[PDB]
Structure formats: structure tokens, C-alpha cells
Amino acid sequence: PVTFGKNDVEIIARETLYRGFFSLDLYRFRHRLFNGQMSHEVRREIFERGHAAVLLPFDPVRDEVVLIEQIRIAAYDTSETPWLLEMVAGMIEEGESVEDVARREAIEEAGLIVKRTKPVLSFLASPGGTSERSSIMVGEVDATTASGIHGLADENEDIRVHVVSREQAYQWVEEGKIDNAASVIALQWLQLHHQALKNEWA
Amino acid sequence: MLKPDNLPVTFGKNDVEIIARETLYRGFFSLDLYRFRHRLFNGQMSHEVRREIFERGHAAVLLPFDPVRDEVVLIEQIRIAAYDTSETPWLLEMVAGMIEEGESVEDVARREAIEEAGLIVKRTKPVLSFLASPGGTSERSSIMVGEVDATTASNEDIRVHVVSREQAYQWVEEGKIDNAASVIALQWLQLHHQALKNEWA
């Protein structure tokens, strides 16, 4: 299919338009057009916020999924509520692996000690404006052990764990009740592979 | 009075107060700082919270599906932001475009299908609306399935690719197609293709 590669791109320069917790960078480049010629200089403002590890907590025995609820203020303007039902996830630091970030986050966010893990899919959230890549892992979990609300809150990350059947979690995606990219992709993947995953982990 | 809306979540918009939004950078895309306070699960109100949010508008996405030939029409184009974590920045994607003032998702999807893939969409059906990455961006993308005749597909920036639905899906499985919009749309299609083909029979 795709034939053009990095040798068909000429990155002239990159600049940081804003640098705070996250960064907004300007990529200035030329690339090959489908007629074979090179383009003029193109400018693109890219949102740089590192990359993420996502963990789909799935209990094979109970056929349940563990969801974490937390506020995502960015969802405010286009959603009925900024509190979303999500997957366990966290930013990949230094030389951490996607598996260890996923397993560590399952402990911090859901109080779950993941057993067997298996890679799922790795996706670009929105290639047109952010470099962010998210790698999904499905982790074998015992849903009966998720933690509850924290008495003394972590105001940087206040989470409430929800345990639902796999079928209901999938239905909520179909219904738009779960609509963040990581959860949609992970739960759609589960719906497409659950019998095989259950048999494998049986 | 009317009963409140049902929420599968604990708190709603009335449980958070946005103090103000400050622009960190303004270009065609912007980076804002939301300052707010919100109820905590332990029943207390939080301290002010500050988050940087990438504001880049919202998009309409169209999965071109030919139910009779069981084919999908993909578009190929460079996405420079994919450069640092992909072998090549040229990605296989769905037809897509930004929704502007006074335009419906369907208007945009139908227009973009013509200018990106030279396709005249017949019936459309809403699939799913997703938040790309709510932890850092407000971007919302609404997906629709557009009924097309894959034989009528048709450019210096975008190349059209007609493949079978199974090929497109297998490419998602192997990681060859890995942008959120395409993965979601094609996984949706893989789960609903027979029902859809029957509906459009």
C-alpha cells in the first residue's frame, strides 16, 4: 500500500511555540506529493504530550471489565459531563516499557494486581494535530478486588472504580456512554476477541 | 420539575465549576489553560485545578463502505505528527474533515468524500462519536458509515485505496492501520458488517 517513507520527507525545522506541562511545536517540512514532486514548505502546529500506555482490565472468569471514572475537563464543551468511564492508563516516562506503565497504573488507579498481560493495539489518537501514541495492553484481573473511593483524595487524579460485565461495557460503547478513543478501541477489540482470550486464559 | 438526565457516571456539569480559561498560545490551533474546581468522590470540593488543553476543533469522519462488493475505500496522506513513532508518516485513513460553523457532521462527511476520494455517498448511518484523547485535547470526532459504490472511487496530497473489508480489518490487526478514527470505524464495521449489508440490501 503506502510507499512513501522518511526519505520522502524533508523536515526543515521544528520549533516550540509554547512549553509548559505539555508543548505545542511547529513542524516545518517538505514532502513528496503523489505525482512524485516535492511540496512547498508546509507548516503544522503539533500538540506534544508524550505517549501513553493503556490497560484493559479484564476478568476472564467473571467476564467482567474494570472501568475507572475520573474528570476530563477537556471533554466539557462537547459532552454531557466531564467525568468519563475509562481504561487504566498513564504516561510512558523515561525508558519505561508499555507493560510496566500499564501494570503500575492498574495498581495506582484501580488497586488491581494484573496477572497475565497481552499486547492489543497501538494507535495514534489524532495524527493531524498531536504526536501522541497510545499502546493498549489487556491484563488478566480479578475484578472482585478493585479498590474503592479514597478518603483523602488525590486531587490530581481522583478516581472511582466501576466493575461491569463485558457485555454491558460493550453496549455502553455502542450507546456512546463510553466514548474516549482508548476505551472504544480496547472494548471493541475485546468484543472481537473475548471468546479466544477466555479460552486462552481458562 | 423535569427529572434529571441519566448519567452512567457519578457527577455531572453541575458538580464542576470552571473559573476561567486562559490562552497559552494562539495559532490556527490553540493551547488553553482551564482552571476549575470539581466535586471529589469523597464528597468534598477540590482545590483549583489547572490543565493545559489543546483546542483544535472537531471532526466528521466517514467510513466508505460498499456492502455489495464488501469493500472499503481508504485515503492515504502524510500526517507529520506520526513521524516520531511510525516507520512512515503516510497513513491509511478514513475520509475526514473539520466541522465548521453551521455544518452538520453529515454535510462535512459527504463533502469530504467528494474532494478526498471522489466518492458520491449514498446512504449514511451514524456510527460513533469519540473524544480523541480527553486528557489533553477537546477534539471530538463523529464517525458515520457512507454507502458507496467502490468502483466509482477516484489527489497530489491524497491517494485513494480500494481494498476488501477483510483486508482493511486485517491491516488494523497487524498495526498497518493505526490512527484512532480508522481503527474505531473498521472495528465497528467488522462487528456490524452483515447487519449493515442486510439493511442496505
Q: Exposed (0-12), middle (13-18) or buried (19+): which is A152, by Cβ within 10 Å?
A: exposed
All cell numbers assigned to B24: 497559552
Cβ contacts of A126 on chain B, cutoff 8 Å: 56, 132-133, 137, 139, 141, 179-181
* Three cell numbers written together for A112: 488491581
Distance of alpha carbon B64 from alpha carbon B148, whole angstroms: 6
Q: Is A94 annotated as a binding residue?
A: no
Instruction: Say if CB B62 and CB B112 are below 8 A apart.
Output: yes
User: Which residues of A are less than 8 Å from B99 in CB distance?
Assistant: none
What angle (nearest 5°) sits at the alpha carbon of residue A176, between those of residues A171 and A182? 90
Q: What determination technique applies here?
A: X-ray
In contact, B85 and A133? CB cutoff 8 Å: yes
How far is residue A34's CA from residue B158's CA, in Å, rounded to a whole number? 7
Please give the full DSSP string across A139-166, using - where no structure is assigned.
EE--GGG-----SS--TTS--EEEEEEH
Q: In chain A, which residues have their Cβ closer than 8 Å to the Cβ of B47?
A: 155
- Nearest neighbour of A125 by CB, restricted to B41, B76, B132: B132
3-state secondary structure of B32: strand
Task: Output helix, strand, coil percentages for chain B, rounded to the nearest 5.
Answer: 25, 40, 35
Smallest CA-to-CA distance from B74 within B200, B181, B198, B192 is with B181
Q: How far apart are CA B180 and CA A3, in angstroms?
A: 21
Number of domains composing chain B: 1
Active site residues per annotation of A? 155
Angle between helices B180-199 and B165-173 (to 10 degrees): 150
Residue-range definition of the domain harbouring residue B57: 1-201
B75: cell is: 485515503
| Residue A170: count of CB within 10 angstroms of its CB | 20
Amino acid at the residue A55: L
Q: Cβ–Cβ of B133/A128 closer than 8 Å?
A: no
Closest by Cβ to A185, choosing from B47, B187, B190: B187
Look up residue B201 and give its amino acid: A
Q: How many CB atoms neighbour CB B61 within 10 A?
A: 28
Distance CA(A196)–CA(A186), nearest Å, equals 15
Q: Residue B138 and residue A78: Cβ atoms within 8 Å?
A: yes
| 8 Å CB contact between A92 and B55 | no
CATH number of the domain that residue B21 is part of: 3.90.79.10
Breaks (C-N over 2.5 A) in chain B follow: 154
CB A173 within 8 A of CB A179: yes
C-alpha cell at B13: 456539569
Q: How far lies B80's CA from each of A81, A118, B10, in Å?
A: 32, 29, 39
* Ligand-binding site membership of B56 (annotated): yes
What's the grid cell of residue A79? 459532552
State the DSSP code for B110.
H
Residue B60's contacts (CB-CB under 8 Å, 6 or more residues apart) are B96, B97, B98, B99, B103, B105, B106, B107, B108, B109, B112, B141, B142, B144
Maximum Cα–Cα distance for chain A, whole Å? 62
Cα angle A119-A123-A127, degrees, rounded to a multiple of 5: 165
- Residue A98, classified by CB atoms within 10 Å of its CB into exposed (0-12), middle (13-18) or buried (19+), is buried
Query: Do A185 and B184 lie within an 8 Å CB cutoff?
Result: yes
Give the nearest partner residue to B179 out of A124, A159, A191, using CB atoms. A124
The full DSSP string for A81-139 is: -SEEEE-EEEE--TT--HHHHHHHHIIIII-----SEEEEEEEES-TTTB--EEEEEEE
Instruction: Say what the resolution is, in angstroms.
Output: 1.9
Answer yes or no: do A126 and B140 touch at CB < 8 A: no
> In a 3-state reduction of DSSP, which class is residue B69?
coil
